[PDB]
Every structure is written in structure tokens, then in C-alpha cells.
Amino acid sequence: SLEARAALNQALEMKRQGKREKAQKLFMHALKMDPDFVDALTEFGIFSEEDKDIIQADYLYTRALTISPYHEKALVNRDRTLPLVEEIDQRYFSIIDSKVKKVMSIPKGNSALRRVMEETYYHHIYHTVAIEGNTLTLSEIRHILETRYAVPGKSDEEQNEVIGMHAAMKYINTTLVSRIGSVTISDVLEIHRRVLGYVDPVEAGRFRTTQVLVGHHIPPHPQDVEKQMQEFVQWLNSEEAMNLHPVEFAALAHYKLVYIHPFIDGNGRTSRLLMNLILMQAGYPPITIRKEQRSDYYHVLEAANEGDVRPFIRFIAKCTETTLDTLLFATTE
Ligand SMILES: Nc1ncnc2c1ncn2[C@@H]1O[C@H](COP(=O)(O)OP(=O)(O)OP(=O)(O)O)[C@@H](O)[C@H]1O
Ligand SMILES: [Mg+2]
């Protein structure tokens, strides 16, 4: 309905100007012209909740969610499944928590743990670059970082991606992990400047100024990148984010940064480092997303884009358990 659309737009204009009596008449008129107008129902629900009429607000929200008979079935079924899913999810976080406490309890000065921590360091670097076509083997990566001699018959681009990761991981471990205070845009840029610096030092440490496309994702317009990065870091240091389970917080921080995708390149590597910083600050070890999990990683990211991030959190939770099981397995004494 063209009149329903018009009635809602004026209803919202009257709401901003503080004419609530006129806004209500127009909300009612929008629903008279189109009873199944989702926008007007949801928006009139928000208006009703502001006036502290909870029953009416709930009626309008529920009406908007259940237009057709198949929506009604979806709601009654979802209301049944949600509690069971909440239980399954909560269980999996408590299972991770127990394994974290077992890893943390082990003395920092342990012969076994030190070897594992040293070996898994190169595993993360390997998987973080190999997941997007870096053909360097694990022994080659160690050679590059331990000796600082280049390997033969492998591109300087591939090897400078490894050097950049090592530089970024050192910076975090020494400077940021134990640093008490808020994480700022500058800190993210400092990580990115090291991650991409050795490959593209021109673009390393500054936002993109062009439109791009990441897989099946449409990231923000370059002119809106900076505002969304300000809103992002505001959330990072919010009380809401502090309450979240570290794995949930680390997963959300990861997804939000690759959604904004504020750099021309190195967005994945940067967002995975920020994920591990948050976990390390919370007392968890650094986790790895293996190159074998690329399709799963992309699938849960595409699901997150279309408005369900829970699969991505669950995916990061799986990657966390796998990392902990690897540390706990090395009790070979
Ligand atoms: N649908 C999606 N929505 C959001 N982010 C996505 C999506 N698909 C992929 N990504 C992320 O974007 C990354 C690719 O962007 P970019 O090339 O800037 O990262 P990179 O650091 O060069 O790659 P990588 O770290 O994976 O080796 C992927 O690795 C992934 O983390
Ligand atoms: Mg890339």
C-alpha cells in the first residue's frame, strides 16, 4: 500500500518532532491501509514500549513475526527449540571452561607445556596464511623465523606474510596482552601495520578508500569505514562485551572486524589476531582455525552476514576445544 508507506513515514516524522498524539493516529492509519505492514507493526510496537504499554508492544511485535501460517509454525517451533539450543550451547562453554582451568593450572615453567607452546606457535602462523593459498610448509616457516634466511623457490610475498604474522604476534604478546586499559583504533592499526607491512607497507596500517567485495559479503562504503570502526572499538570496551563469555566476545570481535573489512587486505589475519588477544587477556591460550576448515569458516561467516552469528560462535568454540585438547594431549610424561 502506497498510503500505508506514507502514513508510517509521517508517523515517524511526528515521533521525532515529539507529537505522539498525531504519531499514534498515523500508526493506526498505516495498519488500517495494510494490516500486515511489518515495518508499521514493529515501529508502532517500539512506540508502544516507550509509553510503557508492554502488552500492546508485545501484540504488535508478535503480529509482525506471524503474518502467514508458516510464520506461526516457525514461532511455536522456535520457542520449543531455543531452550534446548541454549542448554546445548551453555554445556559446550562450561566444557571449554573446565579444559581452560586444567591448562591454566599446569605450572608455567613445565618442560612438556613449553615444547607444545613453541610447536603450536608455528602451527597458528602456518594455518592463518595457508587458509588463503600460502603454499609454505611448516618446516619452511620455522626456517624463515628461526634463521632469518629466505627459502628457495618460494615467492618473497609468501615469506613476508609469515615474517609479518611473527612481528604482529610478538607485538601483541609483549605489548598488548598484559597492557591494562581500553583497546583503540590505533592498537588495531599497529597490529595491521606489522601483519601486512612486509608485503604492502603503503597500505599496511591505514583504512581502504575504495569499494571492495569479500566472498559473498558486501562490506561498508570506504566513507563509512571510520565511523563503524569508532562504533566497533566503543563496543570492544563496553560493559556489555565484558559480561560476555570470552569465547563469545572473541568470536563477535573477530566477525565484526571482517564484516567492516576496513583494510584493502590482511583483514582475516588481523581479525584472528584480535580474537586471540581477547582470549589471552581473559586467560585462554591462542586458538587456531585450520586451513582444512576453510569452507566451514566461510559457511558460518555467510550465515552471520544473513543475521545468525550463533553458528560462527559455535565454530570458534569448536576451534577453541581442538586447541585445548592439543595442549592437554601433550601430557606425554
Ligand atoms: N562472508 C564473509 N563475511 C565476512 N568476512 C568474511 C566473509 N568471507 C570471508 N571473510 C573473511 O575475509 C577474509 C579475506 O579478506 P582479506 O583478504 O582481507 O584477508 P587476509 O588476511 O588477506 O586473508 P587470511 O587472513 O584469511 O589469510 C577471510 O579470510 C575471512 O576471514
Ligand atoms: Mg587477502
Swiss-Prot record:
The side chain of Glu-132 determines which of the two opposing activities (AMPylase or de-AMPylase) will take place. In response to endoplasmic reticulum stress, mediates de-AMPylase activity. Adenylyltransferase activity is inhibited by the inhibitory helix present at the N-terminus: Glu-132 binds ATP and competes with ATP-binding at Arg-272, thereby preventing adenylyltransferase activity. In unstressed cells, disengagement of Glu-132 promotes adenylyltransferase activity. TPR repeats lie at residues 4-37, 38-71. The active site is at residue 261. Residues 2-333 are lumenal. Changing residue 272 to H: In SPG92; uncertain significance; decreased de-AMPylation activity resulting in significantly increased levels of AMPylated HSPA5/BiP in patient cells. Glycans are attached at residue 173. Keywords: ATP-binding, Disease variant, Endoplasmic reticulum, Glycoprotein, Hereditary spastic paraplegia, Hydrolase, Magnesium, Manganese, Membrane, Neurodegeneration, Nucleotide-binding, Nucleotidyltransferase, Phosphoprotein, Repeat, Signal-anchor, TPR repeat, Transferase, Transmembrane, Transmembrane helix, Unfolded protein response. Divalent metal cation. Prefers Mn(2+) over Mg(2+). Changing residue 70 to F: Does not affect level of auto-AMPylation. Its main location: endoplasmic reticulum. Induction: Up-regulated in response to activation of unfolded protein response (UPR). It is found in: Endoplasmic reticulum membrane. A motif (Inhibitory (S/T)XXXE(G/N) motif) lies at residues 128-133. Changing residue 173 to Q: Strongly decreased N-glycosylation. Abolished N-glycosylation. GO terms for biological process: negative regulation of GTPase activity; protein adenylylation; protein deadenylylation; regulation of IRE1-mediated unfolded protein response; response to endoplasmic reticulum stress; response to unfolded protein. The record marks 132 as: Important for autoinhibition of adenylyltransferase activity. It is a single-pass type II membrane protein. GO terms for cellular component: endoplasmic reticulum; endoplasmic reticulum membrane. It catalyses: L-tyrosyl-[protein] + ATP = O-(5'-adenylyl)-L-tyrosyl-[protein] + diphosphate; 3-O-(5'-adenylyl)-L-threonyl-[protein] + H2O = L-threonyl-[protein] + AMP + H(+); L-threonyl-[protein] + ATP = 3-O-(5'-adenylyl)-L-threonyl-[protein] + diphosphate. Its EC number is 2.7.7.108, 3.1.4.-. Belongs to the fic family. It is linked to Spastic paraplegia 92, autosomal recessive: A form of spastic paraplegia, a neurodegenerative disorder characterized by a slow, gradual, progressive weakness and spasticity of the lower limbs. Rate of progression and the severity of symptoms are quite variable. Initial symptoms may include difficulty with balance, weakness and stiffness in the legs, muscle spasms, and dragging the toes when walking. In some forms of the disorder, bladder symptoms (such as incontinence) may appear, or the weakness and stiffness may spread to other parts of the body. The fido domain mediates the adenylyltransferase activity. Protein that can both mediate the addition of adenosine 5'-monophosphate (AMP) to specific residues of target proteins (AMPylation), and the removal of the same modification from target proteins (de-AMPylation), depending on the context. Acts as a key regulator of the ERN1/IRE1-mediated unfolded protein response (UPR) by mediating AMPylation or de-AMPylation of HSPA5/BiP. Homodimer. Interacts with HD. This is Protein adenylyltransferase FICD. It comes from Homo sapiens (Human). The chain holds residues 104 to 435 of 458 of the full protein.
